[PDB]
Nucleic acid binder design. Structure first.
Ligand SMILES: [Mg+2]
Ligand SMILES: [Mg+2]
Ligand SMILES: [Mg+2]
Ligand SMILES: [Mg+2]
Ligand SMILES: [Mg+2]
Ligand SMILES: [Mg+2]
Ligand SMILES: [Mg+2]
Ligand SMILES: [Mg+2]
Ligand SMILES: [Mg+2]
Ligand SMILES: [Mg+2]
Ligand SMILES: [Mg+2]
Ligand SMILES: [Mg+2]
Ligand SMILES: [Mg+2]
Ligand SMILES: [Mg+2]
Ligand SMILES: [Mg+2]
Ligand SMILES: [Mg+2]
Ligand SMILES: [Mg+2]
Ligand SMILES: [Mg+2]
Lengths: 175, 58, 37, 145, 215
RNA sequence: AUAUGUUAAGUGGAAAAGGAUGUGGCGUUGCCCAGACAAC
RNA sequence: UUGGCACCUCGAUGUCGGCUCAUCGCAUCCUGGGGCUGUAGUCGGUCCCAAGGGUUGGGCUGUUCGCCCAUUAAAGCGGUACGCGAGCUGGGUUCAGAACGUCGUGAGACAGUUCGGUCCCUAUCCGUCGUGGGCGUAGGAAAUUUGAGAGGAGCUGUCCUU
RNA sequence: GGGAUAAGUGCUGAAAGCAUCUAAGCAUGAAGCCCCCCUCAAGAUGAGAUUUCCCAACUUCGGUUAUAAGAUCCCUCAAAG
């Protein structure tokens, strides 16, 4: 595991607390926890965590690559956080806030309300651009995929909810 | 029926049926299954004594 | 999605994977999606 | 027809054991228990009367499986009506009525005679660590693995 | 909520507002009392039981049912009441109302409520296949000797038996049946009747159970 | 029951042409720390 | 399906279609959920999951089959002794009469047409539909109940707003 | 209407420094599955539960006798047959 052997994992003012299997992580915007794995051994030289695989099997090789990946996401999101940005394309497509929740208007016969959840803030730039901010990477990825599934992009014209750097393959169908 | 009862009585001394009558042959004993089943019901103390003579012959 | 007993690459961008015991190919254009069966 | 002991009523002694089922696989527990109920560990075993004794299984919600046979291994059933085939998976029975999961596995390892039905009524199975039968004073019994 | 017992009387019609005509079944629901409150602690489920129509007291040489017997007397005394003929249970109601010995009056329903009615059917006796089930009958001329019998009853020799649930003749009869989503149109307090819109199962002077709609 | 190994499909416990980064074993031969082999 | 073999049935396994009554499979006709499209929209084509329910009235033919008229969301393919005659018809066909054509010296025949031509049985056992008596359920009775299990039900169009 | 799923769509993510719906993990998803609706149901020999009513002497208790609560025979009937 060349990404598992790269087990430097330089911390910050975030505090790392081991508890055997499950590991708690707290910092500026912290309190994350995950029951990681039983086989993997954990060590901290001075503050940098480091992950060592035993037994060199096939199952031990793969999990050594993921366990380093999950720990790096748990500390870097407490450090900086994760933001995913997406846009609206189409005439009359307006999105706006209702305080905590979010309201969309994408050409249906009724508006669509996205009920908010914990640790995630919504924000609207100019009634087209919606930002999703949070601390855990799997959580902000799930909600950003849920709300683009209301109206996915369209081949012939490009209308619909699109990621901020998404490429859309377009066909050219003329009457 | 005789073998089933010998197999039950041998496992109270941590022996199979198979290893009892293996080692009982090597010790030189030539007693039946019928007679061996009746000793284990009647006289438990005598049955435990020929278990040891079969057990050290292995 | 083309289901056929013979899945193969077609162009040079398609790639062969496995998902839950089934052989698939994944490519950039959607006309090359194949799964074996 | 010289001389062979035959058991009898007024001649046999039945006692009470307790098995706990956590961390045990289903069939390897059940094969051990079904030989207790028949009496094949008594030295006075006779095939035409009921020697052998009572068994209580107390945990029964921590039975394990190996492989993928908790989403597979369906249990079928027919109601003698046309098209009345019904089924449930093995993982479903574990979370819902787990006592009938174990006692069906054990009664399938007993013979289908009149005596085999009567021997199967000496089994008592409970989910979770309590049983009512403190009056009969049962003992612990560890599985000869 | 809102259970009550009564017996059928007959069927009439009522002119609604703006001259609309609606058929009406009149049910007399008189002298219903609460007779025992059942509990999840004692019994395992919460319910109340209700007795409908009172009957005469204990007598020494009773030869019929209109005199209560000694088991029924002591049961209907622990709640201070007279012995009743019909006793049913209602487990849809809220058990935290209804002190034992109350009289559930007829105006616990207001006009406009949707209800369900339960009773036993009329009863027809031994009936054949085209009456009891909805079967088509054979031709009546052109040489036929097949008029009101059932048809074939199975296949040939694969399945050398008759399957069960085969719809042969037998007793048509009266069994329990509920009708759903009726209405209460007018409640009379002095006569203690309820008018329901439609028709309910049973013969006259039967026994119906009215309770509120589950949907 | 002893000892060594293979299989993860209930294969075992009913079939082919073909297809496939499924996993073990044995060989020949390329590019190797001068920095490949990826991604930048 | 048309066939090959000739293993049960010759001291009889006794009949094509239609009627009545059903039950199963799915290689899906409709409805449901999806992918791709040479899919602008409305419509369509093709593939995948899916068997819960539903799946038409007439004219001509003994007809199966098939053609046609009108409808429908749709008018699916097959198995069950080519499902079912101790449940029904008996138009057809292996019966005796008669006639045409053809063949035959002839008696007769075709497998080619046409008219007419007798369908038995009081249900013993298993099985199914409904209804009762006896015993049991560690005292005997009346009344109200829980629900392990089982059965039923499960369809769909048109119009108005957006 | 709720729960779990099919084809399918995904999030994070290594093996294989990339990419990857999957290997470990987290979601969603059919009129089909299980519940929800109606009916039968403790001969469910595993024979269940609550409320109320009733309680004997002889005796060789071998059984006899009379009996309680409660039922039935018999008679007048139908909303049932
Ligand atoms: Mg090809
Ligand atoms: Mg008709
Ligand atoms: Mg197999
Ligand atoms: Mg194979
Ligand atoms: Mg043939
Ligand atoms: Mg022959
Ligand atoms: Mg021959
Ligand atoms: Mg004969
Ligand atoms: Mg299919
Ligand atoms: Mg005409
Ligand atoms: Mg036929
Ligand atoms: Mg027949
Ligand atoms: Mg002639
Ligand atoms: Mg001539
Ligand atoms: Mg004539
Ligand atoms: Mg004629
Ligand atoms: Mg004719
Ligand atoms: Mg009258």
């Amino acid at each position: 595991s060349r990404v598992g052997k790269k087990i430097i994992d330089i911390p910050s003012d975030v505090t790392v607390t081991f508890d055997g299997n499950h590991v708690t992580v707290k910092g500026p915007k912290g309190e994350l926890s995950r029951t990681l794995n039983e086989r993997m051994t954990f060590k901290q030289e001075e503050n940098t965590i480091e992950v060592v695989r035993p037994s060199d099997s096939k199952e031990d090789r793969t999990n050594h690559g993921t366990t380093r990946a999950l720990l790096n996401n748990m500390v870097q999101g407490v450090s900086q956080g994760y933001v995913k940005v997406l846009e609206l394309v189409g005439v009359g497509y307006r999105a706006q806030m209702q305080g905590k929740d979010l309201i969309l208007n994408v050409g249906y016969s009724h508006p669509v309300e996205i009920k908010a959840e914990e640790n995630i803030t919504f924000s609207v730039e100019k009634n087209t651009v919606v930002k999703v901010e949070g601390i855990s990477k799997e959580q902000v990825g799930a909600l950003a995929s849920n709300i683009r599934s209301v109206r996915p992009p369209e081949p012939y014209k490009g209308k619909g909810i699109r990621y901020q750097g998404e490429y859309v393959r377009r066909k050219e169908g003329k009457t | 029926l005789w073998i089933t009862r010998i197999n039950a009585a041998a496992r109270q001394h941590e022996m199979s049926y198979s290893r009892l009558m293996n080692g009982l042959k090597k010790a030189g004993i030539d007693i039946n299954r019928k007679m061996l089943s009746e000793i284990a019901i009647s006289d438990e103390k005598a049955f435990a004594q020929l278990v040891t003579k079969a057990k050290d012959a292995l | 999605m083309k289901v056929r007993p013979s899945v193969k690459p077609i162009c040079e961008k398609c790639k062969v994977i496995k998902r839950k015991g089934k052989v698939m190919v994944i490519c950039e254009n959607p006309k090359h999606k194949q799964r074996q069966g | 027809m010289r001389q062979t002991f035959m058991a009898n009523e007024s001649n046999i002694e039945r006692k009470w054991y307790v098995i706990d089922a956590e961390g045990q696989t289903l069939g390897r527990l059940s094969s051990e228990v079904a030989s207790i109920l028949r009496g094949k560990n008594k030295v006075t075993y006779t095939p035409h009367v009921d020697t052998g004794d009572y068994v209580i299984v107390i945990n029964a919600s921590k039975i394990e499986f190996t492989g993928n046979k908790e989403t597979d291994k369906v249990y079928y059933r027919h109601s003698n009506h046309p098209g009345g085939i019904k089924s449930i998976t093995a993982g479903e029975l574990r979370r819902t009525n787990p006592e009938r999961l174990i006692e069906n596995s054990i009664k399938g390892m007993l013979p289908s005679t009149r005596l085999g039905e009567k021997q199967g009524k000496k089994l008592f199975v409970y989910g979770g660590a309590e049983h009512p039968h403190a009056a009969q004073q049962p003992e612990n019994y560890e599985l000869r693995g | 909520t809102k259970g009550i017992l009564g017996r059928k009387i007959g069927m009439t019609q009522v002119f609604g507002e703006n001259g609309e005509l609606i058929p009406v079944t009149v049910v007399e629901a008189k002298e219903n009392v609460v007779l025992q409150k059942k509990t999840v602690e004692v019994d395992g489920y919460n319910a109340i039981q209700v007795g409908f129509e009172d009957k005469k007291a204990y007598k020494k040489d009773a030869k019929s049912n209109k005199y209560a017997n000694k088991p029924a007397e002591g049961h209907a005394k622990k709640a201070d009441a007279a012995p009743k003929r019909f006793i049913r249970e209602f487990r849809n109601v809220d058990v935290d109302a209804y002190e034992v010995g109350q009289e559930v009056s007829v105006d616990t329903f207001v006009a406009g409520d949707v209800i369900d009615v339960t009773g036993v059917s009329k009863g027809k006796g031994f009936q054949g296949a085209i009456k009891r089930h909805g079967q088509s009958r054979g031709p009546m001329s052109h040489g036929s000797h097949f008029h009101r019998a059932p048809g074939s009853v199975g296949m040939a020799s694969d399945a050398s038996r008759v399957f069960k649930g085969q719809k042969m003749p037998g007793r048509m009869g009266g069994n329990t049946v509920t009708v759903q989503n009726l209405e209460v149109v007018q409640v009379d307090t002095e006569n203690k009747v309820i008018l329901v819109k439609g028709n309910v199962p049973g013969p006259k002077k039967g026994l119906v159970e009215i309770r509120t709609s589950i949907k």
